[PDB]
Each structure stands twice: as C-alpha cells, then as structure tokens.
C-alpha cells in the first residue's frame, strides 16, 4: 500500500499552494491551445492539399497564420512553465528556511541530521532544475 | 500521425515515471514542513510589563519540572532551589540532571515545564523569546564557531558599533591572535577555527556579555583545554559577579566550582543535597569523595 | 527528442548522510516453507533441472497425468489430425488419378464418389472409425488406393490401442480414493500409559477398504552433526509403536497413531515452551496401501508444524456403541481436551523418574 | 614476501560505516578478543553517549566526532587484527588521557610481550622512556643507536633532563 501511490496529492499542493493561479492557468491554457494549433495546422494542410488536388481558394495566407500562431504559442508556453517552475523553487526554499529556522530543537537532535540534509540539497535540487524541465 | 504514436506512448509512460520518483521529493520536502512548532509568542503585554533587562536574577524556582517526551520519564521532580541574587552562585552536578535540565529551563528550551517560573521577579511564560535568550550568556560543551566577519561574529544581533571589543579581543584572551587577523574587528572566519586559539568560545562569550548586557552568567561542561583557561573563567566570573552580580555555572569539575557562594546537585530524578556555603560541600566528604 | 534527458551533464552532488532507509524488513516473519502440504501436495520446487528430454519421453506416463479436459483436447487432437492427415491423402489421390474433374465417368474413379475435399474428408472419417457407409468405396482400379487403406486402418487401429490404454490407466487413477483419506487438523502430545507419545487421528471415510494399510512417520528438521555437517533437510523415521513393530494398520475406524517417545526418538526433547510458530520441526505421515477396487496404491501425505502441535491434549472418543452396531461420529473427528501432563521434557521426565526410582529403592 | 604490518597514523582514517565494522576492520568477530581491546582503548565511553553504540555512522557522511576520539578508533582497530607486528604513531601525542594510554598499555604489554609481536610506539610518552623496551632516537634523518634505554643515559645530552 505505501507503495502503492499514484501520488496526485502531491500535485496539488505544489501548484495550489506555491504557484498560484494566474500562471497555473496560463500554463493549463497555453498547454491545450498550442496543441489545438497543432491539430489545426496538420487537418488544414490535409483540406489544401485534398481541395487544390484539381467554394475553394489559394491557401497561401491562412496556412502561415496556423504556422505563426504555433510558432508564437511555442514561446508562450516555453517561457510559462519555465517562469512557474521558478516561482514555485524558490518560494518553497523560502518557506522551508523559515521552517526549519523557526522549529524547535528536540526535533533536530531527534532526527538523524541527513533527513533534514536530503530534503534540503537532494530534494530541493530536483525540485529547482528539474520539475521546471 | 499514427508513425508518431510509437513514441509518444513511450514517452509519456516514460515521462510520467520519471515525473512520480521527482514529485515524491515534493512529497517529502512537504513533509518537514508539517512540523508546526515552535510557538514563538507571550501570554501578556511584552512591551513594558516585562523587565527590560533582567538585573538581579531573583529566579526562585517553585515546583517545576521538565520532561522531553511528552513530559514522561521527568529527570526533575518540583525542582525548587534558590539560587543567590546578586551574587555569584555555582551549581555543578556530578552527571546530567543539574546542568541538561537547568540549561534548558533558563532559555524554555525545556519541551515541558510543570509549574513557572520568576525571572527578575517576572514570569518567564509572559515574555519574548528573543529576548529572553538575547541577555543570557551561556558557554557549551564542545567548541562551536561559525565562517563569518568577526564584527558580525561577536554582535551579529546587537550590532554595536562601538570598538571596546575590539579593545576586549586583545584584552580578554588571545592578544596575538587578534594581531594574526589583519582586518581585526572586520575580519572574516578563517575555515571556522581550523586552525585556532581554543578559547574562542569562550571569548566568544566575554564579547558577548559585555555588548549583550548579560547579566546573568550560565555555564556547561569542558571537553579539553588549558588549566589556565579555567582561572582565566574565574577572573572573568568574579567581574561578572562584581559588575553584573549574576552567575549560574554548572560543570562536573568540583575545585572550580568551589570559588562560589553556593553549590548543589540534582540526582536520581530529584534534588541530591543543596548547601547554602561552598565549604559545606567539602563538610560532606561523600560529595567530594564522588569528584575524587 | 520529448525526453527530460536529451542533453544532461555529468552530475555528481553529495547526497550528505543518506541515511534512514525505512525499510519494511517484513520478510522475518513472510512464511515457514512446508516440506509436504496438508493434503500432500509437496512444497518443494526443484531447481536446474538438466533434462535430456526424459520429461517427454515417457509419453505414456505424461498422457495420464494430465488432467481430464487436457486429455480430451489431445484424444480429439489426436483423431482429428489423423482424420484430417489422410483427407489431404484422399483428395490428392484423387486429384492425381485424375477422377476429381466434374465430367462424365468415362474411367473407373480411384475412389468412388470423392467429388470435393470435402467428400474425402467424410471418407477419411468413414475408413479410421470404421464407419464405412458404402456411398465412397475403394476400388480395385488404384493400386496406389490400395495401399492407403492397408495404412489408414493400421494407423488406425494403432492409434486407438494406444489412445485405449492411456484411458485404462487414467479411470484406475486412485489419486482421488487417497483424498478421502482423513488425518486430523493438529497432532497432539499427551501421556499414555506413563509414557510421553505424538499422537495422531487417521480416518477413512469410503466404505471400500483399503487394503494392506502402511503408515509411516518422519521428522523433517535440519541436523548438524558433531563432524559440523549440514543437513538441510534431514529425514528421521519414526517408529509406529505398533504391538508388532511393523507398520501395517487396519483401518475401518479412525485410529490413534502414536509414537512412544523412548530414548532413541528424534522428539526425545521437546519442550511445549519451544513449541511456537517458527520451530524448525516438521513430522510427515505417509499412509499406503492398495485401494480394494483397483488394485492401485495410494500415499495421502499429511504434514504437522510445530505451531500445528498440541502439546497435552487428548483425543475425545469417537466410537459410540448403537443398537445394532457401532457408531462413528466425525463431528468429533479432531476435538481435543486437556489432560494432566508434565511441562518437562522427555528426558527430564525419564530424569525424574530415574530419581523417584533411586530414592524408592 | 612481507607479511601483515599493522599502522597507525598521526591522522586518523575510519570507514564510513558501523563502529565495530570500523573496529574489527573485515576480520572475525569474536567477542573474547573484542572485549580486551575496547575496553583497553576506553571506547565504551563514546558508545555510552552514541545511539546505537557501534552501530552508529561513523566518520564523514555521518556522525562527526572528536580529534581525541577518531584516535581511539585507530588504536583499538591495530590491536584487534592479531598481526605478527604493529605499528602505532603518536597514539598519545593527539590525545593525552591519562586513564585510556595505561589500561591499554597493560594489554599491549601482556599480548606484544607474550606473543613476541613488534610495538614500535612513535610518541613523545615521558612516563614510558626508559625501560626495559629498546628504543631508537633520531634526528636530521638518521639513528643515533637502536639499543638498550640506557644507552641514552650514557650520553651528555639526555633529552633535556628528560622531562624532571
Ligand atoms: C492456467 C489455466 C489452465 C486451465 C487448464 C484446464 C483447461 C480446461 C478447459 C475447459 C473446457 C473443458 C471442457 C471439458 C468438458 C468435459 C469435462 C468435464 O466436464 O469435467 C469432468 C472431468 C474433468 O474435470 P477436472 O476437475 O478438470 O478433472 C481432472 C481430474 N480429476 C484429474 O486431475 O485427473 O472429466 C471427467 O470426469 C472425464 C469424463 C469424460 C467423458 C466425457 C466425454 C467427452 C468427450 C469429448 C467431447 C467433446 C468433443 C469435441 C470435438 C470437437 C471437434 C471440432
Ligand atoms: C474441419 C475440417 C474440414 C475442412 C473442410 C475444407 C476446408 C477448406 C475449404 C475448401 O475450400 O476446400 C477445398 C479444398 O481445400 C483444400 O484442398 C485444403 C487443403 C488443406 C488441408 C486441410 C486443412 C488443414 C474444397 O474444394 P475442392 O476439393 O477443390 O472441390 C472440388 C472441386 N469440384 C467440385 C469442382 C470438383
Ligand atoms: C537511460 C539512457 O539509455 C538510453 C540510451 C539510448 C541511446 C541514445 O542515443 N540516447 C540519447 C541520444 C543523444 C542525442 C542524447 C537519448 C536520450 C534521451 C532521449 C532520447 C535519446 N535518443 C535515443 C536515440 C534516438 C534519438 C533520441 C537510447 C535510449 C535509452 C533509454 O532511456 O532507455
Ligand atoms: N540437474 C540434473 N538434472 C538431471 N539429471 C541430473 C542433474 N544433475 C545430475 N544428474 C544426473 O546425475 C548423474 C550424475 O550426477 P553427477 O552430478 O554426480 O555427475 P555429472 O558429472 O554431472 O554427470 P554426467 O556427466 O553423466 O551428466 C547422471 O545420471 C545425471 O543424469
């Protein structure tokens, strides 16, 4: 059973509770509309090549906005989840550093002295350049 | 579109694996912060009820008792001893009911305390924290220094620019050393005592009873140093005790703690034998028989 | 590629104190593997095994060992394959003879009547199982027919002997009489007749008797010996204690088994303290015989562990007379009571008495 | 050929691992042997404070301890390894407890002595000097003799007063 653990709560309390909602948002938006583009540009190439295989037109205008539209999300989304991942690594570390330095000192004699080492060079290594990525 | 699935099937199982094993650091990094304590707060008014600075270290204990887990399995049963105000007083307990349980009682470091307690006459639970660590000096076991600037390192809270401490680091102990750091009172750690002068924690303390108004005094134990360095503890104690008035120390070396009003010990979970004089000690042989 | 690791560097950052590893540790108390289950059925896997083909090659002994629908599977595989072999022989006879072309019958057909594959398939069933309808003869005009037929029926009559004898063998299976064969939950050690015993409850429950009844009784436990051997799994047999020293039994009710536990035992010193669930001990009984009706021994292998002792318990009477008869009630088939016994050992109990006798004399 | 000289060195070199595993040094445990050497060195002491006792990490990636201690751990590890000869170096110099250099000293006297085992004790000890054990004085990178303890008395110079 602890095994087990698809973990979804995890989730959950990364973005709720450290990214926000503006840039969560942003983030879920441009996800679904870059991916929409995507679709749109290969069904529209599949339309112009069907139809002009000789109403109808000469699609030589609308097929670069699909392409310029993608391109731009491409940016947008890049930049979005890399700026939230930041956002997200260094306020945890913040709260964390007023944890542990507002925490009181049985704890620390108590524990083994690495749990609190891991999870502070280890975990929040993964966490600042790799969760972004 | 059907060529590309093949390997985006791979990759999102792929992706997601590798994405479960880095959000479990999540998970565990919020775990350390689901341990809420550390209360730091007052039950009253802190701004003026209090005592600015505790001055006479009137602390009576009456009736409290400090266990770590829970408060079960108390080293301490309604320890009430009195200590001397205004005056010097050395209390050193052959193991370590006297000084654990009383170091911790002094700052509330204590996880439990069964009863209150007077500080300057005061209540200890109705007053800041910081302060009440800011005004009590206190030496450890073992030498602990940190790497940072020496004017940061002696008054990092305090931040007193004034430059008697300066004139103290040459004066209290290691006058030489003070010469070995060209910057002097700006200078930086040098590896944080890799190669240094074993009274630095205990300067380390000289410079901060000065500049922190420590007037009341606490003591650990030793690991190893010089002889000298305890008669240098002593002429430093009879200056506390002339100036500041206030000195609780506590050690298993009985010779130095002799040099003082009082003397007593807490043993077996309790109080073991309280003398009024240091001589009554050396009256009971058995005490002295125990040190030597 | 849309993989997190298409350009990394070589990382190497100092994990310090990596420690508290949290392990479950679970597998102290995961299972005590059993040397031969409750209802025989061994618990040992062999392992490397080098075979030279010595699984298959007795044929005859793997055919009756699979279970029935196996067996159905391969006795339909067998004919229709058999059947289905000799219709592609039928068909192409036909077809190089030249009689298979839809005209009229100017020559004399190999074999009447084969008109489609169909047609020789039906005529391969009619020749193997002896059908013979008669709309599709064998003529005399096909030398080669001819022979085909001489083929098929040996074939076929070879084929049924086989498949005949491999079916003998499975309805005199007697591994379904050896399960009505009854050993009791857990074994008990109780004193009888001022000697310390491992008794034990066998049943039959068929009215057919088993005849030449033999139990046997082992002690699996590792042995080191005092040259420092070790003996995984070493076997100790252990007397019946029968009147007669032999094994023979006859069982119509359920017997006590018991083995007094004189000074040469294996069991000469068990304590009920060392009794617990992770004891190294084990007694398998094996009771023979040959079952009445066909004439085949059975084993019905039963195992006791140590935490399926039962140490100072007696066996509560089961035979009751009636009016008539006697009376077996297996309701009370295994039902144990407490009986007054010493907590000590064998040889303490032989110690004691050893004193007692000195000090009477 | 050489055979198994045991060492000590004035810095001391501990595995990353349990206590007795830092002890016993992947050599057979056997608790007669262990007893006389633990508590010769007074290592009980550190485990009277530690966790686990000899299970505790010790060294880096672990459980930090003291200079004086690290030498304890250098020392009891020599003797345990029953070598035909041994080697210390400044054993005494980095700590200098009284009560832990002699009750060692009587097991290393008794075991070096009896099973004829070479203890050459590199150290500036004043109380063991002159002797009965030989030792050898150098200076400038040469030895002046390898002899009786006495030889030292017959010369002008003995090591200034030899600590009077
Ligand atoms: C990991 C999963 C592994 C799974 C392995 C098992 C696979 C099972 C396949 C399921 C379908 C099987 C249908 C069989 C129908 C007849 C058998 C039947 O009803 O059971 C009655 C039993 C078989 O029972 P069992 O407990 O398996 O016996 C094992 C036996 N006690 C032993 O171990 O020893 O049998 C008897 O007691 C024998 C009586 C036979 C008499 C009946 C005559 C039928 C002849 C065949 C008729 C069908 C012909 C079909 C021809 C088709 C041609 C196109
Ligand atoms: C369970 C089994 C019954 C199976 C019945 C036939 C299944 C195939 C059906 C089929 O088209 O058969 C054909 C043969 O087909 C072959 O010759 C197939 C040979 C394959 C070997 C047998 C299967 C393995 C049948 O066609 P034909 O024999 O050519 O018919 C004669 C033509 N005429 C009527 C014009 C003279
Ligand atoms: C754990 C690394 O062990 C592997 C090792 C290989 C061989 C290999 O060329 N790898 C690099 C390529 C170079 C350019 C980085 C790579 C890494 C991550 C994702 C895809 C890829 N490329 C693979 C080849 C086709 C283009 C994309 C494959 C797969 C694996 C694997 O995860 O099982
Ligand atoms: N894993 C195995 N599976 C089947 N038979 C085995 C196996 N190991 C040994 N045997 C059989 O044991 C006999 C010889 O055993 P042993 O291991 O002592 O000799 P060997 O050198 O392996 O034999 P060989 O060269 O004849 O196979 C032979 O009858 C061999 O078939």
Same mark, same amino acid.
């Given at each position: 059973?602890?095994?087990?653990?698809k973990?979804?709560?995890?989730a959950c309390?990364?973005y709720?509770?450290?990214?926000?909602?503006?840039?969560?948002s942003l983030?879920?938006?441009?996800?679904?509309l870059k991916?929409?583009?995507?679709?749109?540009?290969?069904?529209?190439?599949?339309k112009?090549?069907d139809?002009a295989?000789?109403?109808?037109?000469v699609?030589?205008?609308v097929?670069?906005?699909?392409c310029?539209?993608? !391109?731009?999300?491409?940016?947008?989304?890049?930049? =979005?989840?890399?700026? =939230?991942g930041?956002?997200?690594?260094?306020?945890?570390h913040?709260?964390?550093?007023?944890?542990? !330095?507002?925490?009181?000192?049985?704890?620390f004699?108590? =524990?083994?002295?690495?749990? !609190?080492?891991?999870?502070?060079?280890?975990?929040?290594? =993964?966490?600042?350049?790799?969760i972004?990525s | 579109?059907?060529?590309?699935?093949?390997?985006?099937?791979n990759?999102?199982?792929?992706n997601?694996?590798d994405m479960?094993?880095?959000?479990?650091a999540?998970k565990?990094?919020?775990?350390?912060?689901?341990?809420?304590?550390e209360?730091?707060?007052?039950?009253?008014?802190?701004?003026?009820?209090?005592?600015?600075?505790?001055?006479?270290?009137?602390?009576?204990?009456?009736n409290?008792?400090?266990?770590?887990?829970?408060?079960?399995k108390?080293?301490?049963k309604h320890?009430?001893?009195?200590?001397?105000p205004?005056?010097?007083i050395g209390?050193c307990?052959?193991?370590?009911?006297?000084?654990?349980?009383?170091?911790?009682?002094?700052?509330?470091?204590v996880?439990?305390?069964?009863?209150?307690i007077?500080?300057?006459?005061?209540?200890i639970?109705?007053?800041?924290?910081?302060?009440?660590?800011?005004?009590?000096?206190?030496?450890?076991?073992?030498?602990?220094?940190?790497?940072?600037?020496?004017?940061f390192?002696?008054?990092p809270?305090?931040?007193?620019?004034?430059?008697?401490?300066?004139?103290?680091l040459?004066?209290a102990?290691?006058?030489?050393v003070?010469?070995?750091?060209?910057?002097?009172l700006?200078?930086?750690?040098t590896?944080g005592?890799?190669?240094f002068?074993?009274?630095?924690?205990?300067?380390?303390?000289?410079?901060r009873?000065?500049?922190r108004?420590?007037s009341?005094?606490?003591?650990?134990?030793?690991?190893?140093?010089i002889?000298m360095a305890?008669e240098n503890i002593?002429?430093?104690?009879?200056?506390?005790?002339?100036?500041?008035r206030?000195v609780?120390?506590?050690?298993?070396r009985v010779?130095?703690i002799?040099?003082?009003?009082?003397?007593?010990?807490?043993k077996?979970?309790?109080?073991?034998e309280?003398?009024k004089?240091?001589?009554?000690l050396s009256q009971?042989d058995?005490?002295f028989?125990?040190?030597? | 590629?849309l993989?997190?690791?298409?350009?990394?560097?070589?990382? &190497?950052?100092?994990?310090?104190?990596?420690?508290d590893?949290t392990?479950?540790?679970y597998?102290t108390?995961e299972?005590?593997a059993?040397?031969?289950?409750?209802?025989?059925?061994?618990?040992?896997?062999?392992?490397?095994?080098?075979?030279?083909?010595?699984?298959?090659?007795?044929?005859?002994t793997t055919?009756?060992?699979?279970?029935?629908?196996?067996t159905?599977?391969?006795?339909?595989?067998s004919?229709?394959?058999?059947?289905?072999?000799?219709?592609?022989v039928?068909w192409?006879?036909?077809?190089?003879?030249?009689d298979?072309?839809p005209?009229?019958?100017?020559?004399?057909?190999?074999?009447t009547?084969?008109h489609?594959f169909?047609?020789?398939?039906?005529?391969s069933?009619?020749?193997?199982?002896?059908?013979?309808?008669?709309?599709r003869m064998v003529t005399?005009?096909?030398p080669?027919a001819?022979?085909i037929?001489?083929?098929?029926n040996i074939?076929?009559?070879?084929?049924?002997?086989?498949?005949?004898?491999?079916?003998?063998?499975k309805?005199?299976?007697?591994?379904?009489?050896?399960? $009505?064969?009854?050993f009791?939950?857990?074994?008990?050690?109780?004193? %009888?007749?001022?000697?310390?015993?491992?008794?034990?409850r066998?049943?039959d429950?068929?009215?057919?008797?088993?005849?030449?009844?033999?139990?046997?009784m082992?002690v699996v436990?590792?042995?080191?010996?005092?040259?420092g051997?070790?003996?995984?799994?070493?076997?100790?047999?252990?007397p019946?204690?029968?009147?007669v020293?032999?094994?023979?039994?006859?069982?119509?009710?359920?017997?006590?088994? *018991?083995h007094?536990?004189? +000074?040469? +035992?294996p069991?000469?010193?068990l304590?009920?303290?060392?009794?617990?669930?992770?004891?190294?001990?084990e007694?398998?009984?094996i009771?023979?015989?040959?079952?009445?009706?066909?004439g085949? $021994? $059975?084993?019905?292998? $039963?195992? *006791?562990?140590?935490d399926?002792?039962?140490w100072?318990?007696?066996?509560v009477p089961?035979?009751?007379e009636?009016?008539? %008869? &006697?009376?077996?009630d297996?309701?009370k088939?295994?039902?144990?009571?407490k009986?007054?016994?010493?907590?000590?050992?064998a040889?303490?109990?032989?110690?004691?008495? +050893?004193?007692?006798?000195?000090l009477?004399? | 050929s050489?055979?198994?000289?045991?060492?000590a060195?004035?810095?001391?070199?501990?595995?990353?691992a349990?206590?007795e595993?830092?002890?016993?040094?992947?050599?057979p445990?056997?608790?007669?042997?262990?007893?006389?050497?633990?508590?010769?060195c007074?290592?009980?002491?550190?485990?009277?404070?530690?966790?686990?006792?000899?299970?505790?990490?010790?060294?880096?990636?672990?459980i930090?301890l003291?200079?004086?201690?690290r030498?304890?751990?250098?020392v009891?590890?020599?003797?345990?390894?029953?070598?035909?000869?041994?080697?210390?170096d400044?054993?005494?110099?980095?700590?200098?407890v009284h009560?832990?250099?002699?009750?060692?000293?009587?097991?290393?006297?008794?075991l070096?002595?009896?099973?004829?085992?070479?203890?050459?004790?590199?150290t500036h000890?004043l109380?063991?000097?002159?002797?009965?054990?030989w030792?050898?004085?150098?200076?400038?990178?040469?030895?002046?003799?390898?002899?009786?303890?006495?030889?030292?008395?017959?010369?002008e110079?003995?090591?200034?007063?030899?600590?009077?």
């Amino acid at each position: 059973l602890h095994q087990r653990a698809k973990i979804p709560w995890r989730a959950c309390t990364k973005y709720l509770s450290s990214a926000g909602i503006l840039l969560l948002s942003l983030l879920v938006f441009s996800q679904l509309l870059k991916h929409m583009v995507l679709v749109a540009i290969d069904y529209w190439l599949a339309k112009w090549t069907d139809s002009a295989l000789v109403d109808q037109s000469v699609y030589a205008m609308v097929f670069t906005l699909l392409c310029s539209l993608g !391109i731009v999300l491409c940016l947008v989304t890049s930049v =979005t989840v890399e700026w =939230t991942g930041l956002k997200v690594a260094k306020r945890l570390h913040r709260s964390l550093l007023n944890r542990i !330095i507002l925490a009181p000192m049985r704890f620390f004699e108590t =524990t083994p002295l690495g749990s !609190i080492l891991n999870r502070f060079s280890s975990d929040c290594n =993964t966490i600042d350049q790799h969760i972004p990525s | 579109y059907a060529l590309m699935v093949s390997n985006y099937l791979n990759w999102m199982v792929r992706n997601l694996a590798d994405m479960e094993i880095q959000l479990g650091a999540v998970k565990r990094i919020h775990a350390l912060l689901k341990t809420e304590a550390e209360s730091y707060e007052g039950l009253l008014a802190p701004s003026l009820i209090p005592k600015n600075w505790p001055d006479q270290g009137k602390i009576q204990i009456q009736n409290l008792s400090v266990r770590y887990d829970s408060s079960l399995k108390p080293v301490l049963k309604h320890v009430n001893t009195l200590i001397s105000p205004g005056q010097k007083i050395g209390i050193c307990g052959r193991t370590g009911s006297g000084k654990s349980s009383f170091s911790l009682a002094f700052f509330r470091m204590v996880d439990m305390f069964e009863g209150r307690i007077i500080i300057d006459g005061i209540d200890i639970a109705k007053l800041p924290l910081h302060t009440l660590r800011s005004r009590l000096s206190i030496i450890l076991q073992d030498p602990v220094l940190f790497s940072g600037t020496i004017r940061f390192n002696l008054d990092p809270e305090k931040k007193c620019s004034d430059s008697t401490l300066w004139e103290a680091l040459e004066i209290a102990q290691l006058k030489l050393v003070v010469k070995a750091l060209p910057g002097g009172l700006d200078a930086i750690i040098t590896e944080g005592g890799e190669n240094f002068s074993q009274g630095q924690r205990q300067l380390f303390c000289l410079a901060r009873a000065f500049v922190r108004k420590t007037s009341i005094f606490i003591m650990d134990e030793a690991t190893a140093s010089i002889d000298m360095a305890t008669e240098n503890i002593l002429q430093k104690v009879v200056m506390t005790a002339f100036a500041d008035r206030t000195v609780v120390t506590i050690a298993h070396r009985v010779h130095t703690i002799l040099s003082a009003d009082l003397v007593m010990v807490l043993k077996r979970g309790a109080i073991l034998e309280f003398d009024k004089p240091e001589t009554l000690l050396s009256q009971k042989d058995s005490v002295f028989a125990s040190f030597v | 590629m849309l993989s997190r690791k298409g350009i990394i560097p070589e990382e &190497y950052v100092l994990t310090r104190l990596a420690e508290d590893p949290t392990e479950p540790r679970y597998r102290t108390r995961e299972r005590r593997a059993r040397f031969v289950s409750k209802k025989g059925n061994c618990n040992v896997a062999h392992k490397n095994i080098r075979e030279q083909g010595r699984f298959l090659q007795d044929v005859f002994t793997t055919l009756v060992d699979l279970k029935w629908p196996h067996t159905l599977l391969i006795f339909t595989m067998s004919f229709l394959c058999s059947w289905l072999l000799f219709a592609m022989v039928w068909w192409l006879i036909a077809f190089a003879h030249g009689d298979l072309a839809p005209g009229e019958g100017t020559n004399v057909p190999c074999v009447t009547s084969i008109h489609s594959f169909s047609s020789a398939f039906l005529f391969s069933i009619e020749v193997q199982v002896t059908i013979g309808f008669g709309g599709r003869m064998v003529t005399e005009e096909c030398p080669l027919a001819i022979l085909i037929l001489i083929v098929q029926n040996i074939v076929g009559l070879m084929i049924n002997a086989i498949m005949l004898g491999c079916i003998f063998m499975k309805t005199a299976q007697a591994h379904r009489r050896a399960e $009505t064969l009854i050993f009791s939950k857990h074994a008990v050690i109780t004193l %009888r007749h001022g000697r310390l015993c491992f008794m034990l409850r066998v049943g039959d429950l068929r009215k057919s008797m088993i005849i030449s009844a033999t139990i046997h009784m082992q002690v699996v436990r590792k042995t080191t010996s005092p040259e420092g051997e070790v003996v995984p799994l070493h076997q100790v047999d252990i007397p019946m204690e029968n009147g007669v020293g032999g094994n023979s039994i006859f069982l119509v009710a359920p017997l006590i088994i *018991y083995h007094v536990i004189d +000074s040469n +035992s294996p069991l000469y010193d068990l304590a009920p303290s060392d009794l617990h669930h992770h004891q190294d001990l084990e007694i398998i009984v094996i009771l023979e015989g040959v079952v009445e009706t066909t004439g085949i $021994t $059975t084993q019905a292998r $039963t195992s *006791y562990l140590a935490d399926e002792i039962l140490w100072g318990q007696r066996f509560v009477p089961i035979v009751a007379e009636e009016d008539g %008869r &006697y009376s077996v009630d297996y309701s009370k088939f295994g039902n144990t009571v407490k009986v007054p016994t010493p907590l000590c050992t064998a040889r303490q109990l032989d110690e004691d008495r +050893s004193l007692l006798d000195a000090l009477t004399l | 050929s050489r055979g198994p000289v045991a060492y000590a060195s004035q810095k001391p070199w501990l595995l990353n691992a349990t206590v007795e595993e830092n002890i016993t040094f992947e050599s057979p445990f056997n608790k007669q042997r262990y007893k006389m050497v633990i508590e010769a060195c007074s290592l009980q002491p550190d485990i009277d404070i530690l966790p686990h006792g000899d299970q505790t990490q010790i060294g880096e990636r672990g459980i930090n301890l003291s200079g004086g201690q690290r030498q304890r751990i250098s020392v009891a590890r020599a003797l345990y390894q029953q070598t035909n000869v041994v080697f210390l170096d400044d054993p005494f110099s980095a700590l200098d407890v009284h009560l832990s250099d002699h009750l060692m000293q009587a097991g290393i006297l008794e075991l070096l002595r009896d099973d004829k085992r070479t203890v050459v004790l590199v150290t500036h000890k004043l109380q063991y000097l002159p002797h009965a054990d030989w030792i050898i004085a150098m200076k400038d990178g040469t030895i002046q003799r390898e002899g009786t303890l006495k030889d030292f008395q017959r010369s002008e110079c003995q090591l200034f007063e030899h600590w009077k």
